[PDB]
Design a protein around this ligand. Sequence first.
Ligand SMILES: NC(=O)C1=CN([C@H]2O[C@H](COP(=O)(O)OP(=O)(O)OC[C@H]3O[C@@H](n4cnc5c(N)ncnc54)[C@H](OP(=O)(O)O)[C@@H]3O)[C@@H](O)[C@H]2O)C=CC1
Ligand SMILES: COc1cc(C(C)(C)C#Cc2c(C)nc(N)nc2N)cc(OC)c1OC
Length: 157
Amino acid sequence: TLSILVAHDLQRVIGFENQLPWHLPNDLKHVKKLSTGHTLVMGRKTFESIGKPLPNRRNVVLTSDTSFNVEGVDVIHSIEDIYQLPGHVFIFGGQTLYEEMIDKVDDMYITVIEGKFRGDTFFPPYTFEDWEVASSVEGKLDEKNTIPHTFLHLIRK
Ligand SMILES: NC(=O)C1=CN([C@H]2O[C@H](COP(=O)(O)OP(=O)(O)OC[C@H]3O[C@@H](n4cnc5c(N)ncnc54)[C@H](OP(=O)(O)O)[C@@H]3O)[C@@H](O)[C@H]2O)C=CC1
Ligand SMILES: COc1cc(C(C)(C)C#Cc2c(C)nc(N)nc2N)cc(OC)c1OC
C-alpha cells in the first residue's frame, strides 16, 4: 500500500524555514501510530530537517547524492525505487516529493490544521472530486494542543 502522510494548514502550508510552523503533539502521536512498524519515504531536505531517522520503522531517503550515508537510513536514488519497497509505505515529505507522488498514491492521511501560517513549503492542490472521505475525525483541543485540527483519510475515487 502506498499512502501520503502529511499535515497542512488552510492554505496548504507544510513548512517554514525547515520547521513545522505549528506545535501539535496530537499529530506527532498520529504519525507514530500510523507509521510505526512500516516505511517512511522522504526527500533529502525533509530528512535533514529532522536530522535523524524515526525509531521503530524503516526510514528511506530519496537523494541524487551518491555519498549520502546515515546510520538507520536506507537510501534510494529514483522515484521508481519507491515501488519496490515492501509493505505499507508512507510518503512523508516534502513539497517536491508530494508533487511527484500525489497522482500515484492509493490514499492520503491528511491532518488539516485549521489556521493560516506563514510558509515557504506547500502541499500540492487537490480536489475532493478525486478523493472519497473514508474518515474525518476532529482532534481534541488541549493544554498542549491549541490549534483546531482534523484527521482525514482520503481514498482515490
Ligand atoms: N512538512 C514537511 O514535509 C517539511 C519539509 N520541509 C522541507 O521541504 C522544504 C522544501 O524543499 P523540498 O524540495 O520540498 O524538500 P524535499 O524533502 O522534497 O527534498 C527535495 C530533495 O529530495 C531529492 N529528490 C526529490 N525527488 C528526487 C528524484 N526524483 N530523484 C532523486 N532525488 C530526488 C533531492 O535531493 P538531492 O538534492 O540531495 O538530490 C531534492 O533536492 C525544505 O526547506 C525542507 O525543510 C521543511 C519543513 C517541513
Ligand atoms: C516527527 O517530527 C518531525 C517531523 C518533521 C517532518 C517534516 C519530517 C514531518 C512530518 C509530518 C507531520 C509532523 N505530521 C503529519 N501528519 N505528516 C507528516 N509528514 C519535521 C520536524 O521538524 C522540522 C519534526 O520534528 C522533529
